[PDB]
Amino acid sequence: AFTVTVPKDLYVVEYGSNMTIECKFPVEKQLDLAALIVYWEMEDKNIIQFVHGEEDLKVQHSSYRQRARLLKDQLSLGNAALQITDVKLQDAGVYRCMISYGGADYKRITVKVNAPYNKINQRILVVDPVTSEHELTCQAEGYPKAEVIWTSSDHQVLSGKTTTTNSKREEKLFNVTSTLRINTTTNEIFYCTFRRLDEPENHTAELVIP
Amino acid sequence: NLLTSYEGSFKIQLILAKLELAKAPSQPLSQRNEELKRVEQRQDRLFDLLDQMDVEVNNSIGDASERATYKAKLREWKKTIQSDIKRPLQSLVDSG
């Protein structure tokens, strides 16, 4: 019988990366490209309509204008692979692949998009050189609401202000900015640690006073 | 050609709807109650595809020798939709 094999039902994809979800179908001897039909859709959105060896770009949804691709080199290997570039939060959901090569079958794949606070921007500005009052600032972008834990090598745990805002570059994910205003010394090492409300493991940046 | 885009879309929707009716009973009751409505969307889409293909058939190249030939294919496909999709769909909404 004709069955479509899915290498993994759950894909956890990091934000900003490329996603390559696979659906495999049996190929015997060779690929009859004329009789092969591949269809990919997410939440009633036409992603890929591949008929007679030719993609149908006119039916493709606007949001998937030049993000989706069908790796045709893998089609001969009995593996229809869907590639999406610049994965965003709206891409999470159930994807449906229907393959008609002789027989026909469809399968579902659940995609979860991870948006960790990986990219950490830092700055150290001097406020009052007399009292060595420095302001340390750490900014990261991610979706699950997060807080910043400021730690030092010597003073150990200190205290800082953390704020939640909407992003300006990308989707509704939040741009968390925390500032620590303390009097420090030269080459005193400070750390800012991003810990969200959810499960993912924390990420820490290092600040060295100039 | 536009009609080829219609042929591809119609064939894909037809196969997908039949498979969704086949896989509905092997699916959670909660998860399936919306899939039965999704099939209704696919069912309405197939009728719109045939009705629009009728416009493009005459507006595209060919003659009456082609006109009658293609519309006979469309009549067979129309009965295919009612026999394989709509009728089995109502035999699933009754259960439960």
Author numbering:
A (entry chain A): 18 to 227
B (entry chain C): 4 to 99
Describing publication, verbatim:
Here we use a geometric deep-learning framework operating on protein surfaces that generates fingerprints to describe geometric and chemical features that are critical to drive protein–protein interactions. As a proof of principle, we computationally designed several de novo protein binders to engage four protein targets: SARS-CoV-2 spike, PD-1, PD-L1 and CTLA-4. Guided by these general principles of molecular recognition, we introduce a protein design approach based on the critical importance of the fully buried patches of the interface to drive protein interactions. Overall, our surface-centric approach captures the physical and chemical determinants of molecular recognition, enabling an approach for the de novo design of protein interactions and, more broadly, of artificial proteins with function.
To test our fingerprint-based approach, we sought to design binders to target the PD-1–PD-L1 interaction, which is central to the regulation of T cell activity in the immune system. We used MaSIF-site to find high-propensity protein-binding sites in PD-L1 and, unsurprisingly, the identified site overlapped significantly with the native binding site engaged by PD-1. The second lead design, which uses the same seed but is based on a different scaffold, DBL2_01, could not be solubly expressed and we therefore designed a combinatorial library to improve expression and binding affinity. From this library, we isolated the variant DBL2_02, which had six mutations, and expressed it in Escherichia coli. From the six mutations, three were predicted to be in the interface (Y23K, Q35E, Q42R) and improved binding affinity by forming additional salt bridges with PD-L1. The KD to PD-L1 determined by SPR was 374 nM, more than tenfold higher than the native ligand PD-1. To experimentally validate the binding mode, we co-crystallized the designs with PD-L1. Overall, for both designs, the structures showed excellent agreement with our computational models, with RMSDs of 0.8 Å and 2.0 Å for the overall backbone and 1.0 Å and 1.9 Å for the full atom interface for DBL1_03 and DBL2_02, respectively, showing a very high accuracy of the predictions in the interface region. The chemical composition of the designed interface is similar in both designs—around 59% of the surface area is hydrophobic and the remaining area is hydrophilic for DBL1_03 and correspondingly for DBL2_02. Whereas the native PD-1 uses a β-hairpin to engage the site, the designed binders do so through an α-helix motif, illustrating the ability of our approach to explore outside of the structural repertoire of native binding motifs.
